Amino acid sequence: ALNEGQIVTLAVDEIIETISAITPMAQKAKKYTPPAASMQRSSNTIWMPVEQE
Amino acid sequence: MQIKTKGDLVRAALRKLGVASDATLTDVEPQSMQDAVDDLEAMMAEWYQDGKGIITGYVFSDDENPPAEGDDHGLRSSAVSAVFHNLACRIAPDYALEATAKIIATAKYGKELLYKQTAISRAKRAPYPSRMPTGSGNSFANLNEWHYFPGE
């Protein structure tokens, strides 16, 4: 043969998925939004009451 | 500063009055010096009204370390002149004197300059009342239900 043509390189753009993780605990831990007046990185301590006895 | 103890302040006051200095041929007794140090302590304690008066950095002597004279007064470099001019004015009457007009003026100026920065610090505005709304232009607060100012 000896077809000494011109060589190329081909990188196809289909991905090989490797990572598939689950997060069960964060989907059960309930989310909260703190009622804070000003947006400050200062101590964000929000106090909430506890059920009375 | 060459004035670094309570007795140094007292010596500066006596020199300012012209009673006793390093050049005079006659000097005051150590008992009178201790009395003047007691006067200095009383005046600074009456100024610093347990923290609600003139804040200077003065350090009040204790009985455990015996001589109040010999203790560093701890004032910053800019309070020495005010302190010892007021001290000269205060202790002048013991020696049947009357402080000169320049000493009195420098005492007034020094005391006012001493309190200037503390006055600037305490010129503080109160927070909004508890009955004042935060407006609606404060979108974050009004979404978080902060319709009225916290206060206190």
From Swiss-Prot, chain A:
Effect in UniProt of substituting residue 13 to A: Impaired phage growth; inability of the mutant capsid protein to interact properly with scaffolding protein
Outcome when changing residue 4 to A: Impaired phage growth; probable capsid protein misfolding
Localization terms from the record: Virion
Essential for binding to the capsid assembly scaffolding protein, annotated site positions: 13
Segments for region (Binding to the capsid assembly scaffolding protein): 1-53
Result of changing residue 17 to A: Decreased phage growth
Function: Self-assembles to form an icosahedral capsid with a T=7 symmetry.
Domain notes: The insertion domain (I domain) plays an important role in the folding of the capsid protein by acting as an intramolecular chaperone.
Subunit structure: Interacts (via N-terminus) with the capsid assembly scaffolding protein (via C-terminus); capsid proteins and scaffolding proteins form building blocks that assemble to form the procapsid. Interacts with the portal protein.
Family: Belongs to the P22 phage major capsid protein family.
Protein name: Major capsid protein
Gene from which this protein is expressed: 5
Span covered, complete protein: 2 to 54 of 430
Swiss-Prot record, chain B:
Pfam families listed in its UniProt record: P22_Tail-4 (PF11650)
Gene3D superfamilies: P22 tail accessory factor (Gp4)
A GO term, aspect molecular function: hydrolase activity
Subcellular location(s) of the protein: Virion
Keywords, comma-separated and alphabetical: Degradation of host cell envelope components during virus entry, Degradation of host peptidoglycans during virus entry, Hydrolase, Late protein, Lyase, Viral genome ejection through host cell envelope, Viral penetration into host cytoplasm, Viral short tail ejection system, Virion, Virus entry into host cell
Main location, first listed in the record: virion
CC per GO annotation: virus tail
A GO BP entry: symbiont genome ejection through host cell envelope, short tail mechanism
Keyword Lyase (UniProt): yes
Residue stretches in coiled coil: none
Purpose of the protein: Tail protein that binds the portal ring and functions as a head completion protein. 12 copies of gp4 form a structural ring at the bottom of the portal ring. Together with gp10 and gp26, gp4 is required for stabilization of the condensed DNA within the capsid; perhaps by plugging the hole through which the DNA enters. Plays a role in ejection of the bacteriophage DNA into the host cell at the initiation of infection. Functions as an exolysin that catalyzes the cleavage of the glycosidic bonds between N-acetylmuramic acid and N-acetylglucosamine residues in peptidoglycans.
Domain comment, as recorded: The N-terminus changes its conformation when transitioning from the preassembly state to the postassembly state.
Binding partners and assembly: Monomer; homododecamer upon binding to the portal ring. Interacts (via C-terminus) with the portal protein; this interaction participates in the head completion. Interacts with the Tail hub protein gp10. Interacts with the tail needle protein gp26.
Name under which the protein is recorded: Head-to-tail adapter protein gp4
